[PDB]
Subunit: 296 residues, 4 copies
């Protein structure tokens, strides 16, 4: 009942137009672009989607648009997480109305919450999701929430939880989670260690860089299944050459810029306070777009 | 032109009613209660005000109500900070319309921003504030933003910045900031070290616990000015006996509960995912309210 | 000229007798036991060897004994690192006299040193090593020294450096190091992610748990070379079931206890302040020893 | 029975000669220099004394020399801490033989030890100290040991513990320790917040910078007792102008250089891997020595 959640799913970017409003035409084209990459699903309204610089109604708008393009074609996961439980429940109710296959919520952040408060937060969102499963987070680096292994085990046991988005570079814990939960849908969250995270126990992944090169991550899955160790390592090397550049330039805006040079997004801007890409990086980003298109 | 910003200012709590909606009647009463405590100002819509579980229109509503009660009576500082620059600018424009004396913005969080992106964020908010000064943050513990001393010096030099809210327990840096900026309005942000923070260079403070015992913090200011070292230490001891209990019970909800037992707030709830206060703590919180009222 | 350094090498434990003195007979037997496991080398006098609760003359004694047993049979690496450069140089000169194939030194710790001070420390030790190569450390978790990628690149370029002991769970950095240094001897230092660390770029490893189950780590190397992804994952699962227990009981003393039940060490004690193993864990540790012996 | 431990005590530096050997003549002169500054005691063989780049016999030599110069004149505290319990016990037995008034030991570091292992370590050292009290540490920044308040309370309750060296900038915890232990000898360990640490509850201090300007820290004690808030703040400002420079140049070697320009130490070197002072800083350090001598 949760096996359709396993796989490689881009964490969708939210295109903005030149005035910082949602670019709905480019959003639809980005959804179709990821579908045509052969991905298993899309993860909508996550941090990568710039959820935390959007209002609730803006996030609902994005969810509804993506469901219009993708429902029944690929798996649809709606990240509904806010700090507020009531805000998260509103987005989860919307994702249900729009036909999403699952919801997800980051551990609520900024304020210190007890573990039981985290559990009650997820329980409330699951209830509002009205029958579609929940993807929990581990995320300690961006959220500041540093969960134990025993707490993870209680989260993935919550009624209605169908998967864990493991946004951690700790592949000892990845292996421990897999060993304790042999059937759990377990997403690798750090793109730069994808091959090693799969080997440590993840059976899929959610990642921002999948928007520009999903076939490489799909190829790593395939190489490891095939027994082609060297091919997995070679593909990860090429992914990380790209991630190196994205870190230098700014990850979300570098991804959006590459997509603009691939004719997917009309405008590659992030919302303030993200600055635009520096002019000195445009040549490398355009060359990267050319290289990735040629590689297909 | 910024001397009216110096002093002891509660970080206002936002009262909610039994359904998690803003309790406007109790908000007005809390403002009047803090005024009658002899405070120098109020800091509205900060983290203590549960800003990050409120919408923009809810935050504007609170700002407007507090200005109605307090303008011309005490200094009014509006915390307008969001992750989004455009959202922060909307709140700053509103604070200006409502007659606030200053705006403030937490360093934008969750996503990694460069220092120049932080500066441009503050510059944009200052522009939207349309002539009232800006209070910058240091805050590294809740926001995850860990700023250098040289960066602080450039922030407090930004045109339009009139003060620094130093939410740090590093009193070496407090002293270095004071030594580099002898005229800077410098708020102590950690209530539990207020006396020591003043001694290290702060000339005032913004704090959540001032809502229930401002006269103690005003008395510490006075004791240090008078030369009564022992009185400052005794008052801080009593403050920290209270802070100990607030940490045990949950700080915002413990403060709101004490205020409810002082007949200031009708309903002491925080928004989810904050749980209600555990029943086992109610006796101690009611006894604390009684003790504080007797002390006046 | 450094290819003989590549491979799987136990970080040797130092056996102590019942009075906390070095147990020289059990040390010799442990060396022969690791040789008979088919390992490529042994790493002597590391943290795992309890170097930092031993005097210099005790560490030299251990080095000399191990060289007597192992020289010409397996690769010999001497960890000579102390906080003091002069102490480290004494141990490096000794390792040279005893016929070691390489020296190694942890980044000097406790006191903050600049990166150039680290480099000069390694240069001095390399000089005293009088022609045998140096294995540098990354280690940030135990030493508190948190090095950048650019600094690593200058360390592995120091004249006389032949390898890097990457004691980090960051497999993005592991991959970046490999991509920047395709020929570098690169040891995985976290046993619990060995398979994933090899996949990320390590071409061998140095580990404390190799003393009781080296054939599993050798088998992971082989499985990845063969293309047997599932076998690598299965072996790592079994390693981590063991590491889980070792963490619960105390790693060094649990390893020594298992070796005592394998008839390798006469006495399984660590030096104070390590406590002895709790009685409640002895059954599990004896069962583990039985299982590992049966597995051969 | 522990009141003689309260006060202002320099953490003694260990002078080395030009070849990195202990400079015994300059050590004796430094002891007499600190005595003539009016200090209450000296703390010997601490981290500031470069204990962790010295052998046990070198540390014993220093202890014995300092007792020869200081016993019966000022309080003598011997830092005997090593990672090894047995090494620490040897130094504690020596300190007893030499007539020290107390011993001290840093929380054992590098390897993770349980809290009970820490307690047993202190108990063993107290026993070897044979009747002189023990000064415990909190130190989390250099040692990596991050102790809770409840654990501190059990440490200062250990039979034979007479004081706590609070090497932390957390002045909430300082105040909590004082409130829980109104009679405890409580040393401020961060020189750069001395005035604020006294105000928060410390009743003395142990510090490296006291070697060059003890009269300023004694004057802060006096100013706070007198009620001269501004004088305490002014003296701390001047201390921190000095600490700023010492951080820029390297603290131990900057202190030793100042002492050399005061004609106290013949040679201002630290042991490798500490580099010598850069030539560009010598003018500032000589001017500082001149200023401090004039100030007396
Ligand atoms: Cl399209
Ligand atoms: Cl609706
Ligand atoms: Cl009222
Ligand atoms: Cl308007
Ligand atoms: Cl044998
Ligand atoms: Cl010799
Ligand atoms: Cl003399
Ligand atoms: Cl003796
Ligand atoms: K990242
Ligand atoms: K707090
Ligand atoms: K470990
Ligand atoms: K320091």
């Amino acid at each position: 009942m949760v096996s359709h959640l396993r796989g490689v799913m881009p964490a969708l970017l939210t295109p903005f137009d030149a005035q910082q409003n949602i670019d709905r035409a480019s959003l639809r084209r980005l959804v179709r672009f990821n579908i045509e990459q052969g991905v298993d699903g899309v993860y909508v309204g996550g941090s990568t989607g710039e959820a935390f610089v959007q209002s609730l109604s803006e996030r609902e708008e994005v969810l509804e648009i993506v469901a219009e393009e993708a429902k029944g074609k690929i798996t649809l996961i709606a990240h509904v997480g806010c700090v507020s439980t009531a805000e998260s429940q509103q987005l989860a109710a919307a994702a249900k109305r729009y036909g999403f296959d699952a919801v997800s919520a980051v551990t609520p952040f900024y304020y210190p919450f007890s573990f039981e408060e985290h559990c009650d937060h997820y329980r409330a969102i699951i209830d509002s999701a009205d029958g579609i499963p929940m993807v929990v987070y581990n995320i300690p680096a961006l959220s500041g929430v540093k969960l134990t292994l025993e707490q993870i085990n209680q989260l993935v046991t919550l009624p209605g939880v169908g998967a864990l988005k493991q946004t951690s570079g700790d592949l000892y814990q990845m292996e421990q989670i897999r060993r304790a939960h042999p059937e759990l849908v377990l997403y690798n969250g750090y793109d730069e260690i994808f091959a090693s995270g799969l080997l440590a126990g993840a059976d899929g992944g959610i990642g921002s860089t999948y928007n520009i090169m999903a076939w490489r991550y799909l190829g790593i899955v395939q190489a490891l299944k095939e027994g082609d160790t060297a091919k997995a390592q070679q593909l990860q090397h090429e992914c990380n050459k790209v991630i190196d550049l994205l870190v230098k330039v700014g990850v979300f805006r570098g991804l959006k810029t590459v997509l603009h040079y691939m004719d997917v997004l009309s405008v590659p801007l992030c919302r303030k306070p993200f600055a635009p890409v520096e002019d000195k990086f445009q040549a490398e980003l355009k060359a990267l777009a050319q290289q990735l298109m040629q590689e297909r």
